[PDB]
Design a protein around this ligand. Structure first.
Ligand SMILES: Cc1cc2nc3c(=O)[nH]c(=O)nc-3n(C[C@H](O)[C@H](O)[C@H](O)COP(=O)(O)O)c2cc1C
Ligand code: SF4
Ligand code: SF4
Ligand code: SF4
Ligand code: SF4
Ligand code: SF4
Ligand code: FES
Ligand code: FES
Lengths: 424, 26, 74, 80, 210, 29, 106, 263, 87
């Protein structure tokens, strides 16, 4: 599977100094100058060969993504935006990187810029995490002191000035076009994609956005080479990823295990075991709230890699595993996720604004069982109207859990329908 | 279940109002 | 005289007509409610007005369904 | 914002007296050709109708919205 | 989402960044790109919130003034984000995560415990003005599900008893242990861990050649 | 282990290590 | 029932009148509500189609049961809002019963 | 040169670079249904009622927004782009208060017609509706804003055509209400245009509140005499008294806008 | 959806060509509408000839005149559109 010798993030769960001294001891900032000296090209070949997929909600080939803003500058400073907003529910994945191994992030940002000529990078850590940022800020201060970051980084002529931006409790801020607008200081509402972020981004200057995990692994991969990373996985879903297990399991934890490992093994080797026995598994949410939940019979068969999941009709996403024993009212579980999205969508687009509120009202009635059985496929149809028509992906995300509940748990919802009709 | 003729008329008002000449002579 | 006070006048050339021939919600209590928003079928559903939902959200103003003129006291 | 009523040419006769009616206050008109608006597909055909029917005509050229350049990316420009 | 003049909250309410605060304000301005100050409205609005939790209409007006932006521009930012409070809040503003990860593991019970001790319903503030309870959504840190963020404290993995205990420390005395209250080391598996046992590999270990 | 003004003050300190930022070149967007 | 006349001057009863019989002009009553200053059904113009009964959203204008309203003078047949409202008050009890019987059908 | 050749259903209307999907449809001759897009107002994409289906493409595109590319075929009357309108109109109408016989933009509604032409025959929103709180934007515009389809045209005009920059969106979710956060009247010339530009009858004219209904109004095209710009205007007369004066477009003089004084 | 019987659409189309070939001289346009109706259009001079062929032809006997009408398209140079419907 994965050996400690072969691990990208090697300071998880603390136990070690998050400061530069400890980070250096661990082996961070190694020949960083040489890396930059290798030249932006060399870094993207590394990432490309690495097959590092985006560790964010949606995995886009890192190499290509970074490559786009590798086109010649048109007189506007290129920029780096690192989304440190851990918005996805069930995902404490990133919080760990910054809190425990921040300096890795710092170097990653530097390596990141060299890859795309960003004078500076801005890290949008969610405002909720006030404590988390301070630590990161401290580490950054130290790196400037070391000369690691700032003018002539590591002596290399490259000049990089990293920043930390306060989030303000919005899941949508996380979106790529909306992170920018929050950075820009306007309301956090995703812009459209046709002018892509590379071409126009933060402050209308070439900009690129990466999940903090994606920025963090790039230096280790650069130093340790693309092949190493490439070997651990299969085809595209190739790489080491932090997988989180939260809910109805013996030991919730963020493992860090290698990718494409059997769902069972992940929750078996680590995570203790499904609380109450593997057979007490009403369903598994593989990528977090946005991805559709998969019921037990499908799960062990399938494993956690993006290709395998899309075959399964679900998304690897943030790889946040939320598990539901046979002791849970799923109709109400998914219902609160729709409540999670009505309290959160920006309302900029018509399909998400009214559609997500419409499903919330129907879902609440479904939990009570007040609604008739015919309404259940009605919500199917409302779901796909929202799925393909939304300006951003959150409407994409709201539709999928609804679709999953109807797809695998249609008989249970009908019974809740039946239960209320009987008592009158 | 166990003189009075309705005279028709317009119920709207004056609409266009003309300018009253000033009663102050000049 | 009438609703919009039609007053064919002492000098009009139309008041001639009547010669020898002749020519509530404010009183309605404010419907107190518990919910922020309330409906107003007009009373009787199909036999009322197209149902509208009024926002009695500010005690400052008693919502008035544009159809019944009924004031609702939050 | 629909433009389906700005397609065909129409020729309309000049407006005339609309005095109030004393008994009921209804509008009253003495001009027969008032409500008549004939619709003609092209300017040339409408001009022909006026000439053979002997009515005077004063044609107004169609004015169509000028092409306007729009692009979502352009307003995102902090510069301007 | 509408503001109405009230003696307690009006432009009349006095607000001005402390000499120390104003200093902070500029620090924010240069962090952002030159010629760009508008981008700092949020960070600044946050320091107005740091100054005073209420952040009344007067405070937003000043923010727009200091940041020379359309005032509405600040009003829109304050309304969109839940982090900013446009109403006075209690001293603690206990925020309970009640979304799927936390729902699982009974966050509601924790809510009940909190409500009981505070003798107040969710979304209501104690007359003591030290406590204000709100049912917030995913606050991150799910591996530790039972959770209640208190002014960033982010206590984690809490059992109902711990919650009341925490309130006790806050109710009369110093703050409780910032962070989780369980045997698990951070987000290590509850009883110990089964990963990263090997000592950290040496700098340059298995470094790809050149 | 941090007071409310820990971050901003830290950021003020970070200024000793930052180049003069660039500008779009206008008085106000 | 409260006493507020049902018509809210949407004026589509005027729009669908085949004979051009109904003439409606309106202005906001001081209450701020919307009411018709003048509502004139010319019964001699009217061909009693019953579409107005159909069209009204609040169902303010109804085809009342009485058929015996023959009048000595032509002017009496022209009806303003006050005659129709008075006609409405006189026959409201039967009109309500009639609408009660036929609304399920409509 | 600079003539992208794109097929609007096969018409190969060659357009200049940067032509938006919608613009190509206009040139070929069609008119993609649309709520948030005004020609002289910035593209916002809020409604997404204009979703069309470029051929051989997985998702439908935003007409007002996608710059048309080379080789595209903007299938407009496809089986998909109609489910992309039959399902949006489902949403705009769901939270809408049905007071169409109050809404004096009765026949002047770009939302009933588009519903009657690009919408569905019936509703499935068995749930409850929302309501917002009517406020005062001034003595000319009556904002019965429970009507608002959050199309952000006003916030644009009030910032782009007129420099008021006051109207703004407040909040998120289904209670985003586009009204001044504090009650400050929208006092500016060019103010009344908001009426004409809001396709919904949420905010309409207060003097011309309920005096008429548009089918009746006989429309005579004339010239503004209040100011020397000589703005073109249409005087809407019913039974012989003027009921409203609203702008008519003159590219050079008043391009769809008229002053607060002359209306 | 109306119960269209393609059987008709074809047979009437076929007659439309038949007539078009039989009287090349006066028939300008012939079309069977989607409403399953044929509307031969003839030059005004063909009024006598086209009718007579339809009244007295074994393969097309159109004995009675249902109606003679004239729509008026003012735009059209030839204002009136005399329409003769035959059974
Ligand atoms: C509603 C919404 C919320 C999102 N939240 C996050 C987030 O909290 N963190 C994140 O990295 N990406 C988030 N994303 C995805 C980003 O927009 C972007 O696609 C991703 O961060 C790209 O990172 P990668 O290229 O490293 O995969 C979100 C997307 C949507 C639609
Ligand atoms: S979907 Fe439409 S509404 Fe929901 S967030 Fe993305 S943009 Fe805002
Ligand atoms: S009568 Fe019914 S329809 Fe005619 S106006 Fe009054 S309300 Fe509208
Ligand atoms: S019945 Fe009602 S609609 Fe029919 S004509 Fe008389 S008035 Fe017009
Ligand atoms: S806007 Fe006024 S008219 Fe158009 S639909 Fe909504 S209510 Fe009916
Ligand atoms: S008010 Fe009219 S214009 Fe302004 S947003 Fe609501 S709908 Fe669009
Ligand atoms: S849902 Fe409460 S923190 Fe993950
Ligand atoms: S018009 Fe295309 S998005 Fe509103």
């Amino acid at each position: 599977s994965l050996k400690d010798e072969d691990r990208i993030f090697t300071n998880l769960y603390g136990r070690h100094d998050w400061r530069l001294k400890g980070a250096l001891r661990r082996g961070d900032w190694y020949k960083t100058k040489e890396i930059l000296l290798k030249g932006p090209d060399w870094i993207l070949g590394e990432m490309k060969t690495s097959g590092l997929r985006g560790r964010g909600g949606a995995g886009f080939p890192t190499g290509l993504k970074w490559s786009f803003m590798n086109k010649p500058s048109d007189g506007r400073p290129k920029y780096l935006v690192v989304n440190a907003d851990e918005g996805e529910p069930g995902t404490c994945k990133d919080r760990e990187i910054m809190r425990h191994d921040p300096h890795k992030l710092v170097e990653g940002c530097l390596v990141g810029g060299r890859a795309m000529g960003a004078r500076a990078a801005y890290i949008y850590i969610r405002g909720e995490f006030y404590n988390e940022a301070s630590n990161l800020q401290v580490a950054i201060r130290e790196a400037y002191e070391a000369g690691l970051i700032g003018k002539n980084a590591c002596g290399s002529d490259y000049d990089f000035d990293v920043f930390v931006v306060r989030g303000a409790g919005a899941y949508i801020c996380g979106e790529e076009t909306a992170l920018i607008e929050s950075i820009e200081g306007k309301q956090g509402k995703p812009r459209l994609k046709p002018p892509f972020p590379a071409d126009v981004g933060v402050f209308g200057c070439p900009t690129t956005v990466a999940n903090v995990e994606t920025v963090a692994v790039s230096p280790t991969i650069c130093r340790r080479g693309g092949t190493w990373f490439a070997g651990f996985g299969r085809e595209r879903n190739s790489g080491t990823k932090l997988f989180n297990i939260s809910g109805h399991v013996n030991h919730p934890c963020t493992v860090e295990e290698e990718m494409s490992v059997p769902l069972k093994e992940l929750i078996e080797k680590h995570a203790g075991g499904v609380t109450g026995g593997w057979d007490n598994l009403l369903a598994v949410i593989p990528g977090g709230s946005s991805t559709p939940l998969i019921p037990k019979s499908v799960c062990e068969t399938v494993l956690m890699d993006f290709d395998a999941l899309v075959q399964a009709q679900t998304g690897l996403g943030t790889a946040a595993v939320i598990v539901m024993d046979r002791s849970t009212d799923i109709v109400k579980a998914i219902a609160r996720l729709i409540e999670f999205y009505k309290h959160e969508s920006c309302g900029q687009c018509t399909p998400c604004r009214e559609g997500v509120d419409w499903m919330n009202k129907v879902m609440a009635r479904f939990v009570k069982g007040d609604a008739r059985p015919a309404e259940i496929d009605s919500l199917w149809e409302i779901s796909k109207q929202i799925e393909g028509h939304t300006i951003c992906a959150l409407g994409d995300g709201a539709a999928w859990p609804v679709q999953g509940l109807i797809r695998h748990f249609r008989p249970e919802l009908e019974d809740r329908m039946q239960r209320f009709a009987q008592q009158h | 279940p166990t003189p009075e003729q309705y005279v028709p008329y317009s119920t709207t008002r004056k609409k266009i109002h003309e300018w009253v000449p000033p009663s102050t002579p000049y | 005289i009438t609703h919009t006070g039609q007053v064919y006048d002492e000098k009009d050339y139309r008041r001639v007509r009547f010669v020898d021939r002749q020519k509530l919600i404010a009183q309605q209590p404010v419907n107190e409610v518990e919910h922020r928003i309330i409906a107003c079928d007009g009373g009787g559903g199909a036999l009322g007005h197209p149902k509208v939902y009024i926002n009695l959200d500010k005690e400052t103003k008693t919502g008035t369904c544009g159809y019944c003129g009924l004031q609702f006291k939050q | 914002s629909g433009v389906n009523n700005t397609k065909k040419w129409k020729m309309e006769f000049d407006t005339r007296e609309r005095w109030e009616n004393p008994l009921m206050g209804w509008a009253s008109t003495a001009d027969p050709l008032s409500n008549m608006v004939l619709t003609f597909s092209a300017k040339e055909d409408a001009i022909a109708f006026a000439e053979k029917n002997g009515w005077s005509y004063d044609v107004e050229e169609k004015k169509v919205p000028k092409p306007k350049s729009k692009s979502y990316g352009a307003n995102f420009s902090w510069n301007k | 989402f509408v503001h109405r003049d009230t003696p307690e909250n009006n432009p009349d309410t006095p607000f001005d960044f402390t000499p120390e605060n104003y200093k902070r304000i500029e620090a924010i301005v240069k962090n952002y790109p030159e010629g760009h100050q508008a981008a700092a409205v949020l960070p600044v609005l946050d320091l107005a919130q740091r100054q005073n939790g209420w952040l009344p209409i007067s405070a937003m007006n000043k923010v727009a003034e200091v940041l020379q932006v359309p005032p509405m521009r600040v009003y829109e930012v304050a309304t969109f984000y839940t982090m900013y409070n446009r109403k006075p809040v209690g001293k603690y503003h206990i925020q309970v995560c009640t979304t799927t990860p936390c729902m699982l593991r009974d966050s509601d019970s924790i809510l009940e415990t909190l409500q009981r001790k505070l003798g107040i319903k969710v979304g209501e503030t104690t007359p003591d003005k030290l406590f204000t309870l709100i049912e917030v959504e995913c606050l991150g840190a799910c591996v530790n599900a039972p959770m209640v963020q208190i002014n960033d404290n982010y206590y984690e993995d809490l059992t109902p008893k711990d919650i009341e205990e925490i309130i006790d420390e806050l109710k009369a005395g110093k703050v409780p242990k910032p962070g989780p209250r369980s045997g698990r080391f951070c987000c290590e598996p509850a009883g110990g861990l089964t990963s990263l046992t090997e000592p950290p590999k040496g700098p340059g270990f298995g470094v790809q050649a050149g | 282990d941090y007071n409310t003004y820990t971050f901003l003050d830290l950021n003020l300190d970070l200024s000793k290590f930052r180049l003069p930022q660039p500008s779009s070149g206008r008085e106000s967007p | 029932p409260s006493g507020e006349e049902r018509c809210i001057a949407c004026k589509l009863c005027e729009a669908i009148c085949p004979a051009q019989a109904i003439t409606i002009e309106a202005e906001p009553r001081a209450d701020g509500s919307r009411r018709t200053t003048r509502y004139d059904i010319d019964m001699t113009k009217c061909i009693y189609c019953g579409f107005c009964q159909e069209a009204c959203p609040v169902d303010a204008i109804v085809e009342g049961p009485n058929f015996e309203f023959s009048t000595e003078t032509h002017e009496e047949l022209l009806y303003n809002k006050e005659k129709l409202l008075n006609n409405g008050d006189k026959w409201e009890a039967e009109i309500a019963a009639n609408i009660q019987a036929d609304y399920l059908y409509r | 040169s600079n003539l992208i050749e794109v097929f609007v259903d096969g018409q190969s209307v060659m357009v200049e670079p940067g032509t938006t999907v919608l613009q190509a449809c206009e040139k070929v001759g069609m008119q993609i249904p649309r709520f948030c897009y005004h020609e002289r107002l910035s593209v916002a994409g809020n409604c997404r009622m204009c979703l069309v289906e470029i051929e051989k493409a997985p998702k439908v595109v935003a007409a007002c927004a996608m710059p048309v590319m080379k080789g595209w075929n903007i299938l407009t009357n496809s089986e998909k782009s109609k489910k992309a309108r039959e399902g949006v109109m489902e949403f705009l109408l769901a939270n809408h208060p049905l007071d169409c016989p109050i809404c004096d933009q009765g026949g002047e509604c770009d939302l009933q017609d588009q519903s009657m032409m690009f919408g569905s025959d019936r509703s499935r929103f068995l749930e409850g509706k929302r309501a917002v709180e009517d406020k005062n934007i001034g003595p000319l515009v009556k904002t019965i804003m429970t009507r608002c389809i959050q199309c952000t045209r006003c916030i644009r005009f009030a910032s782009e055509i007129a420099g008021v920059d006051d109207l703004g969106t407040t909040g998120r979710g289904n209670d985003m209400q586009v009204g001044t956060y504090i009650e400050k009247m929208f006092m500016s010339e060019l103010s009344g245009n908001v009426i004409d530009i809001c396709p919904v009858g949420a905010l309409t004219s207060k003097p011309y509140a309920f005096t008429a209904r548009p089918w009746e109004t006989r429309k005579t095209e004339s010239i503004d005499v209040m100011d020397a710009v000589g703005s073109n205007i249409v005087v809407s007369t019913r039974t012989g008294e003027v009921m409203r004066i609203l702008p008519r477009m003159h590219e050079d003089i008043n391009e769809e806008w008229i002053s607060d004084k002359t209306r | 959806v109306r119960p269209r019987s393609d059987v008709t659409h074809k047979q009437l189309s076929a007659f439309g060509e038949y007539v078009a070939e039989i009287l090349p001289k006066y028939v300008q346009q012939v079309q069977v509408s989607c409403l399953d109706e044929l509307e031969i259009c003839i030059h005004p001079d063909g009024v006598i000839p086209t009718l007579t062929f339809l009244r007295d032809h074994t393969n097309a006997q159109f004995k009675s005149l249902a109606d003679l009408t004239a729509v008026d398209v003012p735009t059209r140079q030839n204002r009136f559109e005399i329409v003769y419907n035959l059974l």
